[PDB]
Coordinates of C-alpha atoms in Angstrom, one line a residue:
Chain A
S1 CA 15.7 13.1 -9.0
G2 CA 16.4 12.2 -5.4
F3 CA 19.3 10.4 -3.7
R4 CA 18.9 7.5 -1.4
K5 CA 21.0 5.1 0.7
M6 CA 20.4 2.3 -1.8
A7 CA 21.4 -1.4 -1.3
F8 CA 21.7 -3.9 -4.2
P9 CA 18.7 -6.2 -4.9
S10 CA 19.3 -8.8 -2.6
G11 CA 17.5 -11.7 -4.5
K12 CA 20.7 -13.3 -5.7
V13 CA 22.3 -13.6 -2.2
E14 CA 18.8 -14.6 -0.6
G15 CA 19.0 -17.7 -2.8
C16 CA 22.4 -18.5 -1.1
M17 CA 21.5 -18.1 2.5
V18 CA 21.4 -21.3 4.8
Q19 CA 21.3 -22.4 8.5
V20 CA 24.3 -23.8 9.8
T21 CA 24.1 -25.7 13.4
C22 CA 26.9 -27.3 15.5
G23 CA 25.9 -28.5 19.0
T24 CA 23.7 -25.5 20.5
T25 CA 25.2 -22.7 18.0
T26 CA 22.8 -21.8 15.1
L27 CA 24.0 -19.2 12.6
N28 CA 24.0 -18.5 8.8
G29 CA 26.1 -20.0 6.0
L30 CA 26.6 -19.1 2.4
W31 CA 26.0 -21.8 0.0
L32 CA 27.8 -21.5 -3.5
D33 CA 28.4 -24.3 -5.7
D34 CA 28.7 -27.4 -3.5
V35 CA 30.6 -25.6 -0.5
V36 CA 29.1 -23.7 2.6
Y37 CA 30.9 -20.9 4.0
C38 CA 30.2 -20.0 7.4
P39 CA 32.1 -18.4 10.7
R40 CA 34.3 -21.1 12.4
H41 CA 33.1 -20.0 15.6
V42 CA 29.9 -22.1 15.0
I43 CA 32.1 -24.9 16.7
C44 CA 32.2 -22.6 20.1
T45 CA 30.0 -22.4 23.1
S46 CA 29.9 -18.9 24.4
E47 CA 32.5 -20.4 27.1
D48 CA 34.9 -21.4 24.2
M49 CA 34.6 -17.8 22.9
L50 CA 36.8 -16.3 25.8
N51 CA 39.9 -18.5 24.6
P52 CA 39.2 -20.6 21.7
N53 CA 41.8 -23.2 20.2
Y54 CA 40.0 -23.8 16.8
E55 CA 42.3 -26.6 15.7
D56 CA 41.6 -28.4 18.9
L57 CA 37.9 -27.8 19.2
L58 CA 37.8 -28.9 15.3
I59 CA 39.4 -32.3 16.1
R60 CA 36.2 -33.3 18.2
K61 CA 33.9 -32.2 14.9
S62 CA 32.6 -34.6 12.2
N63 CA 30.9 -33.8 9.0
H64 CA 27.6 -35.3 10.7
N65 CA 28.0 -32.7 13.6
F66 CA 27.5 -30.0 10.8
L67 CA 23.8 -29.4 10.5
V68 CA 23.1 -27.6 7.3
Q69 CA 19.5 -26.6 6.2
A70 CA 18.3 -24.7 2.9
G71 CA 14.8 -23.6 3.7
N72 CA 13.3 -27.0 5.2
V73 CA 15.7 -29.3 3.5
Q74 CA 18.8 -30.7 4.9
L75 CA 22.0 -30.8 3.1
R76 CA 24.3 -33.7 3.4
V77 CA 27.8 -32.8 4.6
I78 CA 30.5 -35.0 2.9
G79 CA 33.5 -32.7 4.2
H80 CA 34.8 -30.0 5.9
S81 CA 38.1 -27.6 6.4
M82 CA 38.9 -24.5 7.9
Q83 CA 40.3 -21.6 6.0
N84 CA 41.6 -18.8 8.4
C85 CA 38.6 -17.8 10.2
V86 CA 35.8 -19.5 8.0
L87 CA 34.8 -23.1 7.9
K88 CA 34.1 -24.6 4.1
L89 CA 31.5 -27.5 4.5
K90 CA 31.6 -29.5 1.5
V91 CA 27.8 -30.8 0.6
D92 CA 26.6 -33.4 -1.8
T93 CA 24.4 -31.0 -3.7
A94 CA 25.5 -28.0 -5.7
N95 CA 23.2 -24.8 -5.0
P96 CA 21.0 -24.5 -7.9
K97 CA 20.4 -20.8 -7.5
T98 CA 24.4 -20.2 -7.3
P99 CA 24.9 -16.8 -9.1
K100 CA 28.0 -15.9 -10.9
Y101 CA 30.3 -14.7 -8.0
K102 CA 33.7 -13.5 -7.0
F103 CA 35.4 -13.2 -3.4
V104 CA 36.8 -9.7 -3.1
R105 CA 38.9 -8.0 -0.4
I106 CA 37.6 -4.4 -0.3
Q107 CA 39.6 -1.4 1.0
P108 CA 38.5 0.9 3.9
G109 CA 35.9 3.5 2.3
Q110 CA 34.4 0.9 -0.1
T111 CA 30.4 0.4 0.4
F112 CA 28.6 -2.9 0.3
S113 CA 25.0 -4.4 0.8
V114 CA 24.3 -6.6 3.7
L115 CA 21.8 -9.1 3.8
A116 CA 21.1 -9.5 7.7
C117 CA 19.9 -13.3 8.3
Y118 CA 18.7 -15.4 11.3
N119 CA 18.5 -19.1 11.1
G120 CA 19.3 -18.8 7.2
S121 CA 16.5 -16.3 6.5
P122 CA 16.8 -13.0 5.3
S123 CA 15.4 -10.2 7.6
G124 CA 16.6 -7.2 5.9
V125 CA 19.1 -5.3 3.5
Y126 CA 21.0 -2.4 4.2
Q127 CA 24.3 -0.5 2.8
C128 CA 27.4 -0.3 4.9
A129 CA 31.0 1.0 4.2
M130 CA 34.2 -0.4 5.6
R131 CA 35.3 2.3 7.9
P132 CA 39.0 3.7 7.8
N133 CA 39.4 1.5 11.2
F134 CA 38.2 -1.9 9.4
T135 CA 34.9 -2.0 11.4
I136 CA 31.5 -1.4 10.2
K137 CA 28.5 -0.1 11.5
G138 CA 25.8 -2.7 11.2
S139 CA 22.7 -3.8 12.6
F140 CA 23.5 -7.5 13.8
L141 CA 21.7 -9.3 16.7
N142 CA 22.5 -13.1 18.0
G143 CA 22.2 -15.4 15.2
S144 CA 23.5 -12.8 12.5
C145 CA 26.9 -14.3 12.2
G146 CA 27.4 -15.4 8.5
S147 CA 25.5 -12.8 7.1
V148 CA 27.3 -11.5 4.1
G149 CA 28.2 -8.2 2.5
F150 CA 28.3 -7.8 -1.4
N151 CA 28.4 -5.8 -4.5
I152 CA 26.7 -6.6 -7.6
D153 CA 28.1 -5.8 -11.1
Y154 CA 25.0 -6.7 -13.6
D155 CA 24.8 -10.4 -12.8
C156 CA 28.0 -11.1 -10.9
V157 CA 27.9 -10.8 -6.9
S158 CA 31.3 -10.0 -5.5
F159 CA 31.2 -11.3 -1.9
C160 CA 33.4 -9.1 0.4
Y161 CA 32.3 -9.5 4.1
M162 CA 31.3 -12.2 6.4
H163 CA 30.0 -11.0 9.8
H164 CA 31.6 -12.4 12.8
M165 CA 32.1 -10.4 15.8
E166 CA 30.4 -7.5 17.9
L167 CA 33.0 -5.3 19.9
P168 CA 32.2 -4.1 23.4
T169 CA 31.7 -0.7 21.8
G170 CA 28.9 -2.1 19.6
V171 CA 30.7 -1.8 16.3
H172 CA 31.0 -4.9 13.9
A173 CA 34.0 -7.1 12.8
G174 CA 34.2 -9.7 10.1
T175 CA 36.1 -11.4 7.6
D176 CA 36.3 -11.7 3.6
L177 CA 35.3 -14.8 2.1
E178 CA 38.7 -16.4 2.6
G179 CA 38.3 -15.9 6.3
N180 CA 40.8 -13.2 6.9
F181 CA 39.4 -10.4 9.3
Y182 CA 39.4 -6.9 8.1
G183 CA 41.7 -5.0 10.4
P184 CA 43.5 -6.3 13.5
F185 CA 40.3 -8.3 14.9
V186 CA 40.2 -11.8 15.8
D187 CA 37.2 -14.3 16.5
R188 CA 37.9 -14.2 20.5
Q189 CA 35.7 -12.6 23.3
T190 CA 38.2 -10.2 24.5
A191 CA 39.3 -6.7 24.9
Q192 CA 39.5 -5.4 21.2
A193 CA 39.2 -1.6 20.7
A194 CA 38.8 0.2 17.3
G195 CA 40.9 2.8 16.3
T196 CA 39.8 6.3 15.1
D197 CA 36.7 5.9 13.0
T198 CA 37.9 8.8 10.6
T199 CA 35.5 10.3 8.0
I200 CA 35.8 9.0 4.1
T201 CA 36.8 12.3 2.6
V202 CA 36.3 11.0 -1.1
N203 CA 32.9 9.6 -0.3
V204 CA 31.7 13.0 1.3
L205 CA 33.2 14.7 -1.9
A206 CA 31.3 12.4 -4.2
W207 CA 28.0 12.9 -2.0
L208 CA 28.5 16.9 -2.4
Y209 CA 28.6 16.0 -6.1
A210 CA 25.3 14.1 -5.7
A211 CA 23.6 17.1 -3.9
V212 CA 24.6 19.3 -6.7
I213 CA 23.1 17.0 -9.4
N214 CA 20.0 17.0 -7.4
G215 CA 19.5 20.6 -6.8
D216 CA 21.0 21.1 -3.1
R217 CA 23.6 23.8 -4.0
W218 CA 23.6 26.3 -0.8
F219 CA 26.6 25.1 0.4
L220 CA 28.7 25.7 -2.8
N221 CA 31.1 28.9 -2.1
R222 CA 33.4 31.5 -4.0
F223 CA 36.6 29.6 -2.7
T224 CA 39.1 27.1 -4.0
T225 CA 41.7 25.3 -2.1
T226 CA 45.1 22.8 -2.9
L227 CA 45.3 19.4 -1.5
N228 CA 48.0 20.1 0.9
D229 CA 45.8 23.0 2.4
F230 CA 42.6 20.8 2.5
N231 CA 44.5 18.0 3.9
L232 CA 45.4 20.2 6.8
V233 CA 41.8 20.8 7.7
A234 CA 40.9 17.3 6.9
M235 CA 43.6 16.3 9.6
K236 CA 42.2 18.7 12.3
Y237 CA 38.6 17.2 11.7
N238 CA 39.6 13.5 11.5
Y239 CA 38.9 13.1 7.7
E240 CA 40.9 10.9 5.7
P241 CA 43.8 12.8 3.6
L242 CA 42.6 13.2 0.1
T243 CA 45.3 11.8 -2.6
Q244 CA 45.5 12.7 -6.2
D245 CA 44.0 9.2 -6.9
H246 CA 40.9 10.4 -5.0
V247 CA 40.9 13.6 -7.4
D248 CA 40.9 11.4 -10.5
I249 CA 38.1 9.2 -9.3
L250 CA 35.9 12.3 -8.7
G251 CA 36.9 13.6 -12.5
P252 CA 33.7 12.4 -14.0
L253 CA 31.2 14.0 -11.3
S254 CA 33.6 17.2 -11.8
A255 CA 33.0 17.0 -15.6
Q256 CA 29.1 16.3 -15.1
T257 CA 28.7 19.3 -12.6
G258 CA 31.5 21.7 -13.9
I259 CA 32.8 22.0 -10.5
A260 CA 36.5 21.3 -10.0
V261 CA 37.2 18.9 -7.4
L262 CA 39.5 21.4 -5.3
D263 CA 36.4 23.8 -5.3
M264 CA 34.3 21.3 -4.1
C265 CA 37.0 20.7 -1.3
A266 CA 36.8 24.6 -0.5
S267 CA 33.2 24.1 0.1
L268 CA 33.7 21.0 2.3
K269 CA 36.7 23.0 4.1
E270 CA 33.6 25.7 4.9
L271 CA 31.3 23.3 6.0
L272 CA 33.9 21.5 8.7
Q273 CA 34.8 25.2 9.9
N274 CA 31.4 26.6 9.9
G275 CA 29.1 23.8 10.6
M276 CA 25.5 23.3 8.8
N277 CA 24.0 26.2 10.7
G278 CA 20.9 23.9 11.2
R279 CA 20.7 23.3 7.3
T280 CA 20.3 19.9 5.6
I281 CA 22.1 18.6 2.4
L282 CA 20.0 15.7 0.7
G283 CA 18.0 15.3 4.0
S284 CA 21.1 15.0 6.1
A285 CA 22.3 17.3 8.9
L286 CA 25.8 15.7 8.9
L287 CA 28.0 15.1 6.1
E288 CA 27.3 11.5 4.7
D289 CA 30.3 9.2 3.9
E290 CA 29.0 5.9 2.9
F291 CA 28.3 6.8 -0.9
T292 CA 31.4 6.1 -3.0
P293 CA 32.1 8.0 -6.3
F294 CA 31.2 4.7 -8.2
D295 CA 27.8 4.8 -6.0
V296 CA 26.9 8.4 -6.9
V297 CA 27.7 7.9 -10.6
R298 CA 25.6 4.5 -10.6
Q299 CA 22.5 6.1 -8.6
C300 CA 22.7 9.3 -10.7
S301 CA 23.0 7.3 -14.1
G302 CA 20.3 4.4 -13.1
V303 CA 22.5 1.3 -13.7
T304 CA 20.9 -2.2 -13.3
Chain B
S1 CA 23.5 -4.3 18.4
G2 CA 23.3 -1.4 15.9
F3 CA 20.0 0.0 14.0
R4 CA 20.2 0.7 10.3
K5 CA 17.7 2.0 7.8
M6 CA 16.8 -1.2 6.7
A7 CA 14.9 -2.4 3.5
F8 CA 13.0 -5.9 3.3
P9 CA 14.9 -8.6 1.0
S10 CA 13.6 -7.7 -2.4
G11 CA 14.2 -11.2 -4.1
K12 CA 10.3 -11.8 -4.1
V13 CA 9.7 -8.7 -6.0
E14 CA 12.7 -8.9 -8.3
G15 CA 10.9 -12.0 -9.6
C16 CA 7.9 -9.8 -10.6
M17 CA 9.6 -6.9 -12.4
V18 CA 8.9 -6.6 -16.3
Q19 CA 9.4 -4.0 -18.9
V20 CA 6.5 -2.5 -20.4
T21 CA 6.9 -0.3 -23.8
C22 CA 3.9 1.8 -25.6
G23 CA 5.2 3.5 -28.8
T24 CA 8.3 5.3 -27.4
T25 CA 7.7 5.1 -23.7
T26 CA 9.4 2.3 -21.8
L27 CA 8.8 2.0 -17.9
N28 CA 8.2 -1.0 -15.4
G29 CA 5.6 -3.3 -14.7
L30 CA 4.4 -5.7 -12.0
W31 CA 3.6 -9.3 -13.0
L32 CA 1.4 -11.0 -10.7
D33 CA -0.4 -14.2 -11.7
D34 CA -1.4 -13.5 -15.4
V35 CA -1.8 -9.7 -15.1
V36 CA 1.0 -6.8 -15.6
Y37 CA 0.3 -3.6 -13.5
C38 CA 1.6 -0.4 -14.9
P39 CA 1.3 3.4 -14.9
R40 CA -1.5 4.2 -17.5
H41 CA 1.0 7.2 -18.7
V42 CA 2.6 4.7 -20.6
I43 CA 0.4 5.3 -23.3
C44 CA 1.6 9.1 -23.3
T45 CA 4.1 11.1 -24.9
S46 CA 5.8 13.8 -23.0
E47 CA 3.7 16.1 -25.2
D48 CA 0.4 14.1 -24.1
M49 CA 1.5 14.4 -20.4
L50 CA 0.7 18.2 -20.6
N51 CA -3.1 17.5 -20.7
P52 CA -3.8 13.9 -21.3
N53 CA -7.2 12.4 -22.0
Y54 CA -6.5 8.7 -20.8
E55 CA -9.8 7.3 -22.3
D56 CA -9.4 8.7 -25.7
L57 CA -5.6 8.0 -25.9
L58 CA -6.5 4.3 -24.7
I59 CA -9.0 3.9 -27.6
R60 CA -6.0 4.0 -30.3
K61 CA -4.3 1.3 -28.3
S62 CA -4.4 -2.4 -28.8
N63 CA -3.2 -5.3 -27.0
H64 CA -0.4 -5.9 -29.4
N65 CA 0.8 -2.3 -29.0
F66 CA 1.6 -3.1 -25.3
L67 CA 5.0 -4.7 -25.3
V68 CA 6.0 -6.7 -22.3
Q69 CA 9.3 -8.3 -21.6
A70 CA 10.3 -10.6 -18.6
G71 CA 13.9 -10.7 -18.9
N72 CA 14.7 -11.4 -22.4
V73 CA 11.3 -13.3 -23.2
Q74 CA 8.4 -11.6 -24.7
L75 CA 4.7 -11.9 -23.1
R76 CA 1.6 -12.2 -25.1
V77 CA -1.2 -9.5 -24.0
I78 CA -4.5 -11.0 -24.3
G79 CA -6.4 -8.1 -22.8
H80 CA -5.9 -4.6 -21.2
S81 CA -8.3 -2.4 -19.0
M82 CA -7.9 0.7 -17.0
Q83 CA -8.3 0.7 -13.4
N84 CA -8.1 4.2 -11.9
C85 CA -4.4 5.6 -12.8
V86 CA -3.1 2.1 -13.6
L87 CA -3.1 -0.4 -16.5
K88 CA -3.9 -4.0 -16.3
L89 CA -2.4 -6.0 -19.0
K90 CA -3.8 -9.6 -19.0
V91 CA -0.9 -11.9 -20.3
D92 CA -1.2 -15.5 -21.6
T93 CA 1.2 -16.8 -18.8
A94 CA 0.9 -16.8 -15.1
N95 CA 4.2 -15.5 -13.4
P96 CA 5.6 -18.7 -12.0
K97 CA 7.5 -16.6 -9.7
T98 CA 4.4 -14.8 -8.3
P99 CA 4.8 -14.7 -4.4
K100 CA 1.7 -14.7 -1.7
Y101 CA 0.5 -11.0 -2.0
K102 CA -1.9 -8.5 -0.9
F103 CA -2.6 -4.7 -2.5
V104 CA -2.8 -2.4 0.6
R105 CA -3.3 1.3 0.9
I106 CA -1.2 2.7 3.6
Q107 CA -1.6 5.6 5.8
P108 CA 0.8 8.7 6.2
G109 CA 3.7 7.7 8.5
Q110 CA 3.8 4.0 7.1
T111 CA 7.1 2.9 6.0
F112 CA 7.8 0.7 2.9
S113 CA 10.7 -0.7 0.8
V114 CA 11.2 0.7 -2.9
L115 CA 12.7 -1.4 -5.8
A116 CA 14.1 1.1 -8.0
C117 CA 13.8 -0.5 -11.5
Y118 CA 14.9 0.5 -15.0
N119 CA 13.7 -1.3 -18.1
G120 CA 12.1 -3.9 -16.0
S121 CA 15.4 -4.5 -14.3
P122 CA 16.1 -4.0 -10.6
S123 CA 18.8 -1.0 -9.7
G124 CA 18.5 -0.8 -6.0
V125 CA 16.1 -1.1 -2.6
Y126 CA 15.7 1.6 -0.2
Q127 CA 13.4 2.3 2.7
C128 CA 10.6 5.1 2.1
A129 CA 7.9 6.5 4.4
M130 CA 4.5 7.9 2.8
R131 CA 4.9 11.7 4.1
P132 CA 2.0 13.4 5.9
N133 CA 1.5 15.4 2.7
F134 CA 1.4 12.1 0.7
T135 CA 4.5 12.5 -1.1
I136 CA 7.5 10.1 -0.8
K137 CA 11.3 11.3 -1.1
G138 CA 12.5 8.5 -3.2
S139 CA 15.3 7.9 -5.8
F140 CA 13.8 8.0 -9.3
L141 CA 15.1 8.7 -12.7
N142 CA 13.5 8.6 -16.2
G143 CA 12.3 5.0 -16.8
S144 CA 11.6 4.2 -13.2
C145 CA 8.0 4.7 -13.2
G146 CA 6.0 1.3 -12.3
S147 CA 9.0 0.5 -9.6
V148 CA 6.7 -0.6 -6.5
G149 CA 6.7 -0.3 -2.8
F150 CA 6.1 -3.0 -0.6
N151 CA 6.1 -4.6 2.9
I152 CA 6.8 -8.4 3.8
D153 CA 5.0 -10.3 6.4
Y154 CA 7.0 -13.8 6.4
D155 CA 6.3 -14.7 3.0
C156 CA 3.3 -12.5 1.8
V157 CA 4.5 -9.2 -0.2
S158 CA 1.8 -6.3 0.4
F159 CA 2.4 -4.0 -2.4
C160 CA 1.4 -0.5 -1.1
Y161 CA 2.9 1.9 -4.0
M162 CA 3.5 2.2 -7.5
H163 CA 5.7 5.2 -9.0
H164 CA 4.1 7.7 -11.5
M165 CA 5.2 11.0 -10.9
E166 CA 8.1 13.6 -10.1
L167 CA 6.8 17.1 -8.8
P168 CA 8.6 20.3 -10.0
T169 CA 10.0 20.2 -6.3
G170 CA 11.7 16.8 -7.0
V171 CA 9.4 14.7 -4.5
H172 CA 7.7 11.6 -5.7
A173 CA 3.8 10.8 -6.1
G174 CA 2.1 7.5 -6.8
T175 CA -0.7 5.1 -6.5
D176 CA -1.7 1.9 -4.7
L177 CA -1.9 -1.2 -6.7
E178 CA -5.7 -0.1 -7.6
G179 CA -4.2 3.0 -9.2
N180 CA -5.6 5.6 -6.8
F181 CA -3.1 8.5 -6.1
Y182 CA -1.9 8.8 -2.5
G183 CA -3.0 12.5 -1.7
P184 CA -4.5 14.9 -4.5
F185 CA -1.9 14.2 -7.0
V186 CA -2.8 13.3 -10.7
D187 CA -0.7 11.8 -13.5
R188 CA -0.5 15.2 -15.5
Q189 CA 2.5 17.4 -16.1
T190 CA 1.0 20.6 -14.4
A191 CA 1.5 22.9 -11.3
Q192 CA 1.3 20.2 -8.5
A193 CA 2.7 21.8 -5.2
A194 CA 3.0 19.7 -1.8
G195 CA 1.7 20.4 1.5
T196 CA 3.6 20.8 4.5
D197 CA 6.2 17.9 4.9
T198 CA 5.4 17.5 8.8
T199 CA 7.6 15.2 11.0
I200 CA 6.2 11.8 11.8
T201 CA 6.2 12.2 15.7
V202 CA 5.1 8.6 16.5
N203 CA 8.2 7.2 14.2
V204 CA 10.6 9.8 15.8
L205 CA 9.4 8.4 19.4
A206 CA 9.9 4.7 18.3
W207 CA 13.5 5.6 16.8
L208 CA 14.4 7.3 20.3
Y209 CA 13.3 3.9 21.9
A210 CA 15.9 2.0 19.4
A211 CA 18.5 4.5 20.4
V212 CA 18.1 3.7 24.1
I213 CA 17.8 -0.2 23.1
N214 CA 21.3 0.2 21.4
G215 CA 23.1 2.4 23.9
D216 CA 22.6 6.1 22.9
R217 CA 21.1 7.6 26.0
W218 CA 22.4 11.0 26.3
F219 CA 19.1 13.0 25.4
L220 CA 17.3 11.1 28.3
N221 CA 16.1 13.8 30.7
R222 CA 14.5 14.3 34.2
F223 CA 11.1 15.5 32.6
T224 CA 7.6 14.4 31.9
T225 CA 4.9 16.1 29.9
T226 CA 1.1 15.5 28.7
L227 CA -0.2 14.8 25.3
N228 CA -1.9 18.4 25.2
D229 CA 1.4 20.1 26.3
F230 CA 3.4 18.0 24.1
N231 CA 1.3 18.6 21.2
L232 CA 1.7 22.5 21.6
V233 CA 5.4 22.0 21.0
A234 CA 4.9 19.5 18.2
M235 CA 2.5 21.9 16.5
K236 CA 5.2 24.7 16.9
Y237 CA 7.9 22.5 15.3
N238 CA 5.8 21.1 12.2
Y239 CA 5.6 17.5 13.9
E240 CA 2.4 15.6 13.4
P241 CA 0.1 15.6 16.6
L242 CA 0.4 12.6 19.0
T243 CA -2.8 10.7 19.8
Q244 CA -3.5 8.2 22.7
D245 CA -3.6 5.5 19.6
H246 CA 0.1 6.5 19.0
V247 CA 0.9 6.0 22.7
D248 CA -0.7 2.6 22.6
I249 CA 1.3 1.4 19.7
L250 CA 4.5 2.7 21.6
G251 CA 3.6 0.6 24.5
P252 CA 5.7 -2.5 24.0
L253 CA 8.9 -0.2 23.4
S254 CA 7.9 1.5 26.9
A255 CA 7.8 -1.8 28.6
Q256 CA 10.9 -3.1 27.1
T257 CA 13.0 0.1 27.9
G258 CA 10.8 1.1 31.1
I259 CA 10.6 4.5 29.8
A260 CA 7.1 5.7 29.9
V261 CA 6.0 7.3 26.6
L262 CA 5.1 10.6 28.0
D263 CA 8.8 10.8 29.5
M264 CA 10.1 10.0 26.0
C265 CA 7.9 13.0 24.8
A266 CA 9.5 15.2 27.3
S267 CA 12.8 14.1 25.8
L268 CA 11.8 14.9 22.3
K269 CA 10.3 18.3 23.5
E270 CA 13.8 19.0 25.1
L271 CA 15.5 18.1 21.9
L272 CA 13.2 20.3 19.7
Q273 CA 13.5 23.1 21.8
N274 CA 17.3 22.8 22.5
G275 CA 18.5 21.2 19.4
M276 CA 21.2 18.4 19.2
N277 CA 24.0 20.8 20.3
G278 CA 26.4 19.0 17.3
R279 CA 25.7 15.7 19.1
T280 CA 24.2 12.5 17.3
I281 CA 21.6 9.9 18.0
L282 CA 22.2 6.4 16.2
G283 CA 24.6 8.1 14.0
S284 CA 22.2 10.8 13.0
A285 CA 22.2 14.7 13.5
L286 CA 18.6 15.3 13.0
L287 CA 15.5 13.2 14.4
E288 CA 14.8 10.2 12.0
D289 CA 11.1 9.7 11.3
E290 CA 11.0 6.7 8.6
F291 CA 10.9 3.9 11.4
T292 CA 7.6 2.8 12.4
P293 CA 7.2 1.3 16.1
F294 CA 6.6 -2.0 14.3
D295 CA 9.9 -1.5 12.3
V296 CA 11.9 -0.9 15.5
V297 CA 10.4 -4.0 17.1
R298 CA 11.1 -5.9 14.0
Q299 CA 14.9 -4.8 13.6
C300 CA 15.3 -4.9 17.4
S301 CA 13.8 -8.6 17.7
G302 CA 15.5 -10.1 14.1
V303 CA 12.2 -11.2 12.6
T304 CA 12.6 -13.2 9.0

């Protein structure tokens, strides 16, 4: 029993982290096969970041200006190219620790593990969600850029995120591993405000199912609702609309607990309208939305 | 910026996890040098667990009855001994991935990372604290026994916990790596009730300092207090007493923020007496107590 905010084991990703230095900027790179992926803003001074022209800045850079260090050993850069907002540094050595991997672009509400790195060295691992406004709420200090987000399916690492930016509001923005930002953000130090950080309704419902499985049941009530009725209340509380697709995804948790998805929606509706009244659910005073239905099934079944 | 519940990178520990089978019981082992450490209840049927005599049960066990598998390769057991509540299986091969390590016995309030494992295979990593009642609130299903808790200091893994037991209340009990239970618990399926789960005051204070560093300041007030006055309120709210030792440990966070420890105690006192009034601190509606002062400094400075 028990239900924890749980990250994927980080070993396979730790084996991929390198240090990338260009001039006075040091950040992290991801070494897969004979390519090191890093934020293209490695080429920028903090002055450059105010209004960078990346193509023009890159003209002044050669392979030998990109210093790539894997532990205490230097990698030889034999080529470089810009793909969207990432640099791809071709090196002369294939990473011997390259895991099976994919690059995936996740949707808002999807969770992933972040391995926070400084100077190519892992400091910690935590679980995140892609927010409905395409930010993440991470823990990233100067030097953490190029830290990556990932899911693991048995032995295949799916890389979904690379850290680039902190907004003036202290929330985080980055790219997939093809260098495309999540949401409308750009790698420029400018007025970038996030939209509404809505709650990921399907994730809250999953986590209420996790609570029932684990013996926290006080919030179950005698009511049901409809998707349309629930969605009026969701809208009022800045929750994401619930779709039949979400109801379908929750079906296995519904089956296991014998609680119809719409009954659990009616419990959530009362919690929104009534509050927690100083009670907790799985040790939380607010409704947790950074567990997907897949996460709840995985953790409640002990997948490795 | 940002502050996350962060586990140590798990790679060094992943390299140590093995499967241990005795008869029909499979659980996890920790392979360091040529010794595999596992809960001695690997020798028990669920029937045995009601009233086990471990010495008597062990007489019927030989080296060849302990099946140790590291990935898909079998290890040869050349000896076995019982130390307190753990078995030490001597194997003929030193773990080639053995990290620098220590065995430490932590105090209540100390945090650590758990690598949850099933069948010798890591499923996830999360952060825990040793509760003041010597339980932990983990996420452990059948098969998770022998999963370990650890801290890392640069490249040295300090192992502090091995998972043994779930109490009927769904909280967790285990041993240090010398096989001594934390608290009064035993490896027997019997009435074992935990004492009061008090809040780790020094950890809450650390986390309020983390909040200030990260821009969450609404709870700072115009008041101060004394240790004796604060401690009357702590006692009323089932918080651990604060000692001058705790004040000393918080000194660096006091220095960095310019908030005297006793001023932060006065903020905590008002939060206890007034509640959160539906507000959050670092995304939490309750006061977090699973960050040590060392954890806050580490995460706020980006140690690797």
